[PDB]
Structures are given as C-alpha cells and as structure tokens.
A paper describes a structure:
Crystals of AheGH1 enzyme belonging to the monoclinic space group P21 diffracted at 1.98 Å resolution. The asymmetric unit of AheGH1 contains four independent molecules, with a calculated Matthews coefficient of 2.42 Å3 Da1 (estimated solvent content of 49.31 %). The overall structure of the four AheGH1 subunits is identical (RMSD values of 0.05 to 0.08 Å over 356 backbone Cα atoms). Electron density map was overall of good quality, with electron density coverage across residues 2‐450 (chain A), 2‐451 (chain B), 3‐447, (chain C) and 3‐446 (chain D), except for a short stretch (P304‐D322). In addition, two nickel cations were identified in the model, present during the affinity chromatography purification step. The metal cations are located at the dimer interfaces between chain A and the symmetry‐related monomer C and between the B and D subunits and are coordinated in a tetrahedral arrangement by the side chains contributed from two histidine (H61) and two glutamate (E29) residues. The molecular weight was determined to be 99.7 KDa by gel filtration, consistent with it being a dimer in solution. Regions which show more significative changes in the secondary structure correspond to residues 272 to 281, folded into a gamma and two β‐turns, and residues 409 to 416 that form two β‐turns instead of the more common α‐helices. In agreement with CBG and other GH1 members in general, the active site pocket contains several conserved polar and aromatic residues that are typically present in carbohydrate recognition sites that binds the nonreducing end of the substrate. Based on comparisons with GH1 members, AheGH1 the main active site residues present are: R79, H122, E167, N166, N296, Y298, E356 and W402. Based on comparisons made with GH1 members in general, E167 and E356 are likely to be the acid‐base catalyst and nucleophile, respectively in the reaction.
In this work, a novel β‐glucosidase (WP_026963033.1) of the glycosyl hydrolase family 1 (GH1) from the extremophilic organism Alicyclobacillus herbarius (Ahe) has been identified and investigated. β‐Glucosidases (EC 3.2.1.21) constitute a group of enzymes that hydrolyse terminal, non‐reducing glycosyl residues from glycosides. AheGH1 is arranged into a single (β/α)8 barrel fold, common to this family of glycosidases, with negligible main‐chain displacements in peripheral loops and α‐helices. As a particular example, the evaluation of the hydrolytic capacity of AheGH1 towards the most common isoflavone glucosides found in soybeans, concluded that the enzyme can efficiently convert isoflavone glucosides into aglycones, and hence, it constitutes a promising candidate for the enzymatic production of soybean isoflavones.
Numbering used by the authors:
A (entry chain C): 3 to 306, 309 to 319, 323 to 447
B (entry chain A): 2 to 319, 322 to 450
C (entry chain B): 2 to 319, 323 to 451
D (entry chain D): 3 to 307, 309 to 318, 322 to 446
Write the structure that this text describes.
C-alpha cells in the first residue's frame, strides 16, 4: 500500500493498556484489581483467560521498548496500573512507581514520546469493595492518585490521559455486565458514568496545579451510527444510539452537558439524576489540552429492547465482528470537530483483529496493512479539510488480553507467542515503521 | 456631528415598531381585546394610567409614516402584526384586520422598503389569556394557526418573518415579575410560559417551511450583557447565573442545545421538576431558522445578593445613562455579538432593535438630540468591528422609528428618531433621523 | 356555661370542614396540584408561609376523627371532596382518590352520621387553572363532569350535595383582591369567574336531576349583614352597594331572579359590558335546588369612602374574635329574615357558623367559654327565626377541628376540637362538649 | 388436629418483615432500599412484582394489630426498615421513628410482646452505593443505627433481633444473585458474611451499654441435611452442605469460629480470608440472650462433581416453595443446636409453609397449614420434653406478603390478603392457631 503524507507536526505511535500486557499480578505489592476479580470469576472471560501473565511486559519491557526504537516509533501510549500504585487503602507503593520510572527512562533513551493513561479499567478491588464508581468518593481517590503521578513521574511524561473509554467502564462494567466489575443495573451504570466524568474533571484541575508542564486530555471511543433505512423510526433509533455511544461523554467534556433529549429518555426508564450535584458539569468541563479519539468501526441501527429500543445489524469485517468502514472515521472526525472546534485531536486507538497465523517465521497479515492504510487515508482527508488532527496511535503494539474475549483477538502489529513470550514483528508492523520513516 | 460608518454591500438598515405601541384604534374594525388592553386599563399597572388606545394612531397615519420613511430613504422597516386584529375571538378570522396590513404592505412595496414582520410582539388576544394564555400548551397551536394564516394571505408582500419578539420579557416580565401583561406573579407559570413560547416558535417555523413563502423566517431575542461587579468568586458566580437567565435561556434551546442545564437545575430547586417539557419539544423548538434577530440596549453589572431568594442577583445602578436608567456601554454590544457567534456560528444575524430614550424637547421646531446621535454612532462602530472580525452581521434596525407607548413606562420614554407630539399627532423628524438618514445614503453611494 | 336551645324535631346539627384545610398528604395516592397548593407555596401569599401540606393529616386520621364524632354524638358532618384527588390531570380519573372518600363515607355510615358533601371548596386543580380556571367557561363543563362522577360513584353514601362553597370569595377574593387562590387582581376576570361559577352550579344541578341520586342538592353562600354607619344619604347608599356586592350577587341569580341590576350597571361602568353572560345562562343558573346553605359569621358597618375607586365603600372595625370580626348575633336573625324574603319556603341550612379564639390548652383542657357564648347566641337567634316561621332545617358548626384558615394559615383556631399540629393530637375543647350536650338535649326532648 | 401442650413460660406469636408487608416506599422520607432497586430491575423478581404497595401495613397497621389482639396472639415479631430511619448518609429521619413508635404503642395497648428485627435484608441503597456488606464500614453504620433504635424505641420493645438469616443476605444476595443486591461473586459473599456477623457483634456491644431493659439475639435459618445414601462421598457432601447452611454463622456466634474443615475448602475455591481482622470473632461471639431458629424443611444432598462445593439437592410431600414437609427434621435440628448453644434460650422465630390458598364463599380452609403447624408444634414439644430451652414459637407469617424473588406467588400467612381489595381474611389455620394459643 502507498504511504500517506501528513504535516510535519503529525505524531505516530502505538498503544497498550496495563492489565492487557503487564502481567506479574502479584509482584512487588500489586493489589487485586477489578479485572483480577472478574477474569477469575467463572463464566466471565472466554475460556477463563486471565491477565495473570499476559505479555509479561513487567519483565520484558526493555526488549519491547527496544523493539519500538528499532522500528523507529516516535511515541508510545501506555497506561499506569492504579493497583500497582495504591494496592490498598491509603497505601502508596514505591515499587509500583519505581517500575514506571524505569519504563519512562527506557522510553527517553530511545527518544520516544509517552502518552500515559491514568485509568484504563483496572480499578483496585478495595475501591470496588467500597462501591467503586457508584461511590462518589472514588472520583476523589482518583484525583489524589492522579496528583501523585504528576509529581513523581511528570518529568518523563509528555501527555497525560485521565480516562480511556468511559463508556465501556460505565456501561459495559455496570450496565451490561460483560466487563468488570460485571454489574447489571442501569441506574448504577449512569451513576458511574457521572462519577467517571467527575473524576476526569478533578484530575484536570489537579493537573493545572500539578507543576507538570505537559498536556492533559481524555480519550473517548466512538461508534458511528447510520440508520438502517430512511424511515422515521429507524432515523429516530439511530439518533438515540448516537447520543448513547458518542454524545453522552463528549458533550459534557465540551461544556454542553448531557444530551438533553436522551437524558429525559434515560430518566424515563430510571428516574431523576440525584447524583448530578451543583457544580459537577463545570468541573467535568474544565478545559483540556486535547481529545483522544478511539475509532474502530461504525454501526447500523434499526428500531426495535425495553431500554432504548435499539438493535444493531451484524456486519468485510474484523474477527471482532466489526465492519471495516474507513470513511465512517472521516465522518466521525468531522462531527467531533463540530463540537470541539480547534482543540487538538489525536487518534489514540485504531486497529483491527484478524486471524493472525505465523508461518515460516513470518506473519503475513495483509488485511491489517490494508486496514491501517484505509483509515490513514481517511485520517488524511480530515487533515486536508483543516481538521486539527495531531496524531494517530495504533492499537496495538503487540497482541494482548482483549478483555472479555481473552487472548482470542490479536490486535497487535507484533505477534506474541504466549507460550514462549517471543515478539515477532508482523508484516503490518514493518509497514507502519516504513510509514514512520517516509513521513520523516 | 459624527462620521458615518462603512458597512459591506448588502448590509440592511431599517427602523422598528410594535403594533400595540403605535397603532391605536383599539376598537376599530372588530379588533379583539389584547392582554395589554386589559393590563394598561388595570389601575396601577402603567405609568399615570397611559394606554395604547390612541398611541401614534398609526392605524390611520400609516401612509404618511411610510412616505416619511420613503422620503428619508430607509431601505427596510420592522413592524409587528397585531394578533387580535386577525383573530379577535376564538377561531374567527377577521378580514378587515388582514386588509389593513395588506394596505400597509402595498405602501411599503411601492416605496421599495423591505418588510420584516413580527408575528408576536406581546399583544396576546385576551380570549386566549382567558384560556390560560402562555401557561396553556394549546396557545402554541393557536399561534401556529395564526402564523400559518399570515404566510398565505400576506406572504407575497413580506420579505422576512419574525416569530417572537423578546420571549424573555413576555415570559418573565408578564408571568414572573408581573410588570408587563398579563401581570402574573408565579415563577412556575413564568418558566412554563417560556417553554410554550419556544414551542410556538418551532411550530411556526415548521408551518413556514410548508407555507410556500419563499422568504426568510427567524426569531428576535433580547440580550443583556453581564459583567461581574467584582473578581469575587461570589460575584463571578452570580454574573454567570444572570448570564444564563437573560441570554442563555432562549438562545441555546433555539440553537439546538437545550436549556442551560446548571441554571435549570437551580430553577428546579427553587420551583420543581419541569413537567411541561415533553419528548420532542426540544427538537421542535430547535427547528432550523434562517437568521437570528438581536435586541441589545445596555449591559448590567451584576453582584451577588442573598436577599433575592430566587436567583440571588443584584443589578447595580448605571452619569452616563439613558432615561430608562440604562448604561450606555457600546463595547458590550461587540462582546455580545461575539458570544452569540460562538453559539450560532455562521447563522445570519440581524440587530432588529437598538436605540436609546432621551429627554427630547422640540425647540424652534426641531429636536437637537445630539445624545442619540452618539448612541447610534457608537454602536454602529461596535457593530462594524464585529463585521471586521468576521461576524455574520447582516443588518441593523433602529428602535424606534417614532416615539411610542413604552409599555409600563407609558409615553414618558421617547425612543424614536421622529418626534411625536401626541396632542396633534404631528411627527417631527429629529436630528437623529437626519443623521441616520445620511448614514443610509453614504452606505448607498459607496463604491 | 349556658342553657341549651330547643329546636323542632327534624332539626339537624353537625360540623363542617373542607378538604385542603384538613386533609394534608397532598402528594399521596396520585393527587394533583391544586391552586391552593400553588398559591400557598408562592412567597408572601399566606401568613408565615403556612401550607396545607400536612394540615390535620385527616387523610390518615379520618377513622379517628369519625369515631370522635360518634363519641360526641354528632348527627351530621359536612366535608368537601378534593377535586385534584379525583382528576389529577386533564382526563385522568384516579381510583385511589375516589377510594378514599368511599372509605370515609362508609365510616360515616357505620357511625350513623349523615353526610353533606361539598363538590368545590376552592381547591381547583392547577391543570384547570393552567387553562384559565374560572375565567374560562370550559371549566364549568369540567365541573359538571366531575360532579356527575361523584353522583354515580359515591351517591349511595351521601345524603345531600352542596355544589359550591362561598362563590363570592373564590371569584372576588381569588381574582379581584388576590388574597386567595389563584391570586389574580382583575375585576373583569373576577366577575367573569363569578358567572362561570354560577353557571357551573346550574350544570351540576341538571346533572344531579338525571344522576339517579335520590338525595338533595343545593349550594352554600356566605352572607355578611351590612348596617349603615350613619343616617347620611351616602352611607345609606354605600351600605346598599355593599349589600348587593356581598349578599345579592349570587343568591338572587340562583333564586330565579337575575343579577342585582342597579349594582350591576355600576359594575359595568367601572369595567364594561357583560359579554360573558350568554342567553340561557340565567335559566341554567336558576335550576331549582332542594335547599340553600347559609354561611354567616359577622356583620359589617359600612360607610361611604371616596378613595375606593371601584365601589366606594369602607368597613369599620368592631367585642370581636381573632379574625377582627364583630360578634353580632342579631344580624344572623336579620339575615335569615332577608333570605326568606327572597327564597321563600325553600329549605334552609346553616352550613357554617363559628368563631376564631385564642385557644390555649391548660392542664390538658381548653376552656374556651367565649366560643360557648358565640354558638349559644347564634343558636338563640336561629331559634327566633324558627319561631317566626322560618324554614331553617339545620345548623353546621365551623369547624370540627382547628385547621388551615387559608391566607391566615394556622393562626386562627375555629374548631371545637383543639389540634396540636406537632403531634396531630386532637383535644376536644369545652366548646365540643357543650355542643355535644346540645345534641343530646335536642335528641332527648319529648315531643 | 389436637392442641399441643406447652409449659406456662411458652410464648406464641406471629412474624413479619418490613419490606414484605409495609409498602408506601416513597412516603415520609423513606430512602431507596436495595430491594427497591432489585425489584425494579427487570427479570429479577417473579413477574416484576415489587414491594411498592405490598400489604399496605404502613396504613393498615392499626387494623392488623387489632386483628392480632382479636385472635389473642401473645407476641409479634416484626422488623424496622433501615431506609425509613436513615434514608441517606448521616440523616436521621424522625418520621421513620414516628411510624414505629405508633406501631409499638398499638401493640402495647393490645398487650402484645414485640420482638424487633433490626436488619431484614432491606439495606439502604446509599449504603449499597458504598459497597454494602462487602464494605466493613456498613457493619459500623449498623451499630449506630442499632444504638439509635435502643434509645428511641427501647421502652416499647421486649426483645431485639440484630440480623435475620445472614445466610441469605450474604450468599443469596452476593453469591447466587437471586436476592438483592443481586451480585454473583463468591469472594464478595463470604466477605459480606463476615461483615454481617461483625455488624451483629457491634450491635450486641451497643445494646449492653444501650440501657435497654430487654434481651438481644440473632435469628439464624437452618435447613437440616441428610445424605442421599450411606455412600462415603454422599457422607462427605452432606457434611459440606451442613457446614455451609447451618454451621457458618451459628458456630462463630457460639465463640467457636468458622467451621475450619469447610473454611479451608472455601479458601481453596477462592483464597485466604484477608477480611478476618484479629479480634473480629471475639466481637462476633459477644454473648447473646437468645437464639432465633428459622426452620422450614430439610434438604437431601448427594455428591456432585458444581465447581464450588460439589453439592446437589434432590427435592408429593412438598409445599408451593417445593420444600419437603419433614416435621422430625425440626427435632433433629433443635437437638444439634442445643449441642452447640447449651442452655441458651431458644425461640423458633419463623416456621410455616406456602400452600395454594384459595377463598371460596368468604373463607379459606388451608387444612394443610393446620397439619403443618401442628406437626412442627409436636416436634417442638418433643424437644422441650427432652429438656430443651425452647421458649417460644413464631409462626410465619401473620398474613400473606411479598415473598422476595417469587413476588406474591407464595402465601405463607395465616391471614389471607386480597391485594386488590387489601382485605384481611383470617385463614382456617389462623382459626386453629388462635385456639392453640387459648388452650395453652
Ligand atoms: Ni378609523
Ligand atoms: Ni399515607
């Protein structure tokens, strides 16, 4: 595939999440997370897969960073594990900070920028024992955990990310139950969504006083919605799913509040939002430096479901079942800019899952090479239209634990043989590296 | 003496009036009683018992007034249609009321003066107020009925339509504070009337898109730029509450963003849940318009006050002010247009009202109202700077064309650029009218 | 200590209450908001912000209150049905509201207490006031709708019906002076509301004559006897003006006659022509009734005053009660005489009579001997009206227990049973026992 | 059936529970409970039944007490609704105490002894938002809520019951998920069981200094277990089921700690109990004044290779709950409980059956319920004839009510309730029990 051209400002990188790659779940005082409890609960993860070992990134980070530098990747988005820092109540763990200190010093010698997510769904179980995100105090514990990372690790970090996909943590974790902690109460799920948004604002406030001289933001994931027909009832359900997946978190960040027509819809099946206190939407909407965009696929939604009356039609698609629709990314970037305007935008997560197979010591994943190129072209058209797209982070650097589906989905440009823990750079990874060098 | 302000090519100047404020002839040709006829004739409600019984008698002198606007060379003219003249009783079309506005529009067409017609300028028919008025959701449908009739029988002579004029006053001054008609004092009824007013606007725009009228339609909202009296955190918060009350409550719903949520939850704490907002009402109110009319007059320096149990605000005294006690602060106009642009974007904007009230006394047969010259010149200056910044300002309507009934203050406030001596009904063009007329010609003859 | 009064055998004693003033529990079982819920929660409208939120909690303690009537031996009991409990919203029949009054009536049935049920004691649903309330003629139709449902669902446990209670206040105090719900101040609207209230009474009687209810139906009016302050020809004229305002405006239309013509044409001079009296409305209002309820408390010595622009009246102050009301028992006799001269031999009932006194319980006992003298005096005056051949058939003491005295809140104690609102405890005053002994004396007299 | 004879000390009564009987959930400040959240969650309670109205005891309590005194019932066991007292965090609601102060004086006027349960599962949702019984703080809020009841209502209460069936609250509410709050985490369930036990000990300590004159205890439910056959693996499974149902709470209350051989099986399936702090079991074992036995049926258990404990229950002689009517199993139960508690006074606080009661021509003849009551009453007499400290028998229930996850489909009461009329029709079992009381 042809290489795609971008301005000099443009920034490339890969993305990982702590619990999906790190492993070493008992090492150096790490406390139990909600995903340790969930994956070890029978019937919750595909084939009972665990994050016990994962990619052993806790021990093989030096090689993985060296693999990044050898390919010349300019940046790296990873996450800091809250349980490694605060294993139990009010107990800082210096072995947790010292690990992430040695990881950042490895990124600096390789001359690799670091975007670090503070919360990527691995909430400590002791906080879950205290109600977790249904409890408003959790939003205040995250601010203190955010403030410590600012002081102890700030110098070696370029950009901070407070939350990754609050839609999943709130609704998949407390509404549908397919994610940790696995609750199925929709009042609790929308209550968690407000406290997550509230916890984001408190961390942005603490960051402005944190003396850290870098950028701060938040990554939201979007699933573009296209009505199944020109019908009024299908165009109606498509607008409901758009507010659910794409508007519920972005607009409060943008200082607009919750989507009002959709909120009165939610309160109708639940009740009045007694968890929205006076001043929360102002704290939630404290100005950030950038917005992280996580796109993967679009949805086609027809009318139907006692909650929102929605039904998505199955998908040319990913092993996740996700249809590969590249311009839906351009349509998404265009709509986001209508709400965000000139604020810098990074694609913090984009990729696909294909049935990767290693033959003759080579992974010939032609499908991902085409996927990366299609969305890179789609990302390029948004740059030509004047959109403030600053970077594109590839998901993922290496195959890892894809949550409820276990290790059955290999999103990585580097093949990981989980029995030998050997990193084998796929053909899609070398193509990305050529895209890096071609840009610079 | 002031220098004239240059504007882009298709900038549209004009003057604005209101039906009940100028027309008079409240009993002629079967006109029904309006809420302002009932309000002004109720003792203690209007300054010295003044009413709009006669006003400027524009119902009889409209040809002289139109020809005076042609002589002065005014390209546009904003006026309102009196709902009682068209539907004097429940479901009764009045042809004589429609015929008058038909005669007026023919005079404007011959004079080559563009027409911007306001469908509701506060004169609700009393028979609708007898049925609950704006507190009743049925009023929004009767407005969509009367709005749809005007599109068909009068749309050909009309360039642009304006659904509502200053919904903030009709809702909160007529149902909350009670200083305007109908004079109610119930804040739940006020915010309920405000929603039904917004609902009637969306219904009227929906009716306009199916009306076969090919001109523009919009809404006129009045704003009051707020400035915190101090950098104090309690004064900054109050100024935010005042900003949401006056400027955000009606614009943001029309702009498809819903009510300001933080301020609405405070309103609900003082009153209760908003049981009058139904599903789909927000989308209806947010029906796309072609332009937004902007009414600006002054600012307000807001300081917090726990004495006010509703919103906790206090407005400081304006020296350098008008006869309404309104501070003359032209920079606030520029800063308001910039914020409206940040909300509306590239939506075309019109200043459908701007002016001042000054103690005008005709000496030697003409009014040397130098102080109004400086008001119009300073704000057109601030208006032009909003254009040079890239703002989509498309016109400017001076309020008013002639002195008229200034609502609760009666005839003791002279906003016009033409003096009206109500004893003889003689119109005397003031110095403001001459300067404003020269500003048109200078804009007309620029290369 | 007073001697008991003798009355004919068929004479019926009882006590009277009203829904909103005693029931409380205004959010429970789907009850809709009434105009008095909205009025009392509006600041400055009721003394010290008192509301009927809790009141006597009769909604929960009705069995204990009925049993207390049984213990004291009260033969009859007058109460009103809260319209919001039956129709909380437009076209929404609430079975829980009908179920409560079903439970209360069966409790009165077991205690052998005849029931007089008032259909409208001022607590109009706010959803009806949102549509104009009594200023809208549609309200009269909805009242005949709600009255017709009470006839069929509850008529079996109801001995007599009372359509309206004191329409003079609901119309003039609610829409003219504004001291009562809905708190409007428009005298055109007040007299318009008074006609629709009279019209709603006629429609409810027509519905009753076809309702299959085998009991009586009537209407309750409040009268204030007026005596001229002097012999001056203007004080005589002013007392005539007040007499027509308070006593004649509703009784005479009900009694087959029309509105008092001389006073009406003065009202029309102050306002305008009565365009709300359609032909046939008088015939509807004058639908024959079975009895007339009489509410009487005081007189009023009236002197002419030029400062009153409306009617030109001045009431002098008054030996009187905590309401500031003179205790003039002979005025009751003169009132019943005048009503008889108008209504003839139509059966008469005193549906309300009592006084407010500063009852303070000492040693667990309220020695309110002043209320003893009040009831005994007026019962004597009522006995004279019987001795003259007057068709007075009953006497209802207002009230059974201390309750929400409307705008004056809980600062006026009219009941014969003291209510401690902190514990909701009921303590029968000395007035309750004397009045109870008056029952047995009438029940035990051999004839 | 002939009336059963008992000593003069013996004390009869009927039992109810707040959420099952009261209704009026929104009235006078009652906060949301975990059973309001659970009932209004779809697919959790049979046919979406709720305790919204229930028996409307909040309004008919005078009628019900008068009906009890008409039948001459010596005692009444009910529960105080925690949400009525503390609707939200740190907010005493005197209206909640006002309802229960009127009910007690109604019983005192009728000369009826009152046994009051402080917790009958209706945990306030604001406490559940803080993690509920998985959070140790809940055990300390319960001690405060218990200490308040002692000072404000102590005079009108003869005996207190701290908890009712902690086995169901812990394991059905947090392990199986069929009861509120509906979690399915087995570590959370045993963690909740310890905090429920811990909350009982704190409430007993608070009572010993409460200045209340009466007695305090705990109500524990038991299901006697007999192995399916003589088989050694059925012998083992019946012992595991025995410790799970009957030993996990009674023995810690008796100062014996958790059943060790069963606990190490539990730690095998989960992990070491990190929630048992030193000194807990000492507080747990605070000496009580009586023990409340809740018996309904036995269980027949055979081995089953169940990944948790390896148990399988088997079941012509069953009620509408599907429970075998085994009167002799009650005697076997009381003998074993006496072997553990010695001469501690024992009250049967709940005992009854659910039969398909049907009213024909204004009266119900539940002759199966008279047989059930008289069967266990004879089994109760055999225990005291052997020297057992059985001092009271409480029938469940006084009237039909909301039977939790089954809604109103099970009528346990001796007074029929037609939930559309709310009329109380005394059952022919209530006929017999009122005469059995009069005979003794
Ligand atoms: Ni004329
Ligand atoms: Ni109640």
């Amino acid at each position: 595939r042809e290489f795609i051209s971008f301005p000099q400002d443009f920034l490339f990188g890969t993305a990982t999440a702590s619990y999906q790659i790190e492993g070493a779940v008992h090492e150096d005082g790490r406390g139990e997370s909600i995903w340790d409890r969930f994956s070890h609960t029978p019937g919750k993860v595909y084939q009972g897969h665990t994050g016990d070992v994962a990619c052993d990134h806790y021990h093989r980070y030096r090689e993985d960073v060296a693999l990044m530098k050898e390919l010349g990747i300019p940046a790296y988005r990873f996450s800091i594990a809250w349980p490694r820092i605060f294993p139990e109540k009010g107990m800082k763990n210096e072995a947790g900070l010292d690990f992430y200190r040695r990881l950042l010093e490895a990124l600096h010698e390789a001359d690799i920028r670091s975007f670090v997510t503070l919360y990527h769904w691995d909430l400590p179980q002791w906080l879950q024992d205290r109600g977790g995100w249904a409890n408003r105090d959790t939003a205040e514990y995250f601010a203190e955990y955010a403030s410590l990372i600012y002081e102890r690790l700030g110098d070696g970090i370029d950009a901070f990310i407070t939350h990754n996909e609050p839609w999943c943590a709130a609704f998949l974790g407390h509404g549908f139950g397919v994610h940790a902690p696995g609750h199925t109460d929709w009042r609790e799920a929308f209550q968690a969504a407000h406290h997550i948004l509230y916890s984001h604002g408190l961390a942005v406030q603490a960051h402005r006083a944190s003396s850290h001289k870098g950028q701060i933001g938040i990554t939201l994931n979007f699933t573009w919605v296209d009505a199944a027909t020109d019908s009024a009832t299908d165009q109606a359900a498509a607008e409901v799913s758009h507010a659910f997946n794409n508007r519920w978190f972005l607009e409060p960040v943008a200082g607009r509040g919750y989507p009002q027509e959709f909120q009165q819809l939610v309160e109708q099946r639940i009740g009045q939002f007694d968890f929205v206190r006076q001043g929360d939407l102002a704290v939630i909407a404290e100005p950030i430096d950038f917005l992280g965009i996580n796109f993967y696929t679009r949805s086609v939604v027809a009318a139907n479901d006692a909650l929102f009356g929605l039904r998505t039609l199955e998908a040319n698609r990913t092993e996740m079942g996700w249809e590969i629709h590249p311009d839906s990314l351009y349509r998404l970037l265009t709509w986001v800019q209508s709400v965000t305007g000139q604020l810098p935008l990074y694609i913090t997560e984009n990729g696909a899952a294909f049935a990767d197979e290693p033959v003759n010591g080579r992974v010939e994943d032609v499908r991902r090479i085409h996927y990366i190129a299609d969305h890179l072209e789609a990302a390029k058209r948004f740059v030509d239209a004047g959109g403030p797209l600053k970077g594109y982070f590839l998901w993922s650097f290496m195959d890892n634990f894809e949550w409820a589906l276990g290790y059955s989905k290999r999103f990585g440009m580097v093949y990981v043989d989980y029995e030998s823990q050997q990193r084998l750079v796929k053909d899609s990874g070398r193509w990305f590296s050529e895209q890096i060098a071609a840009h610079k």
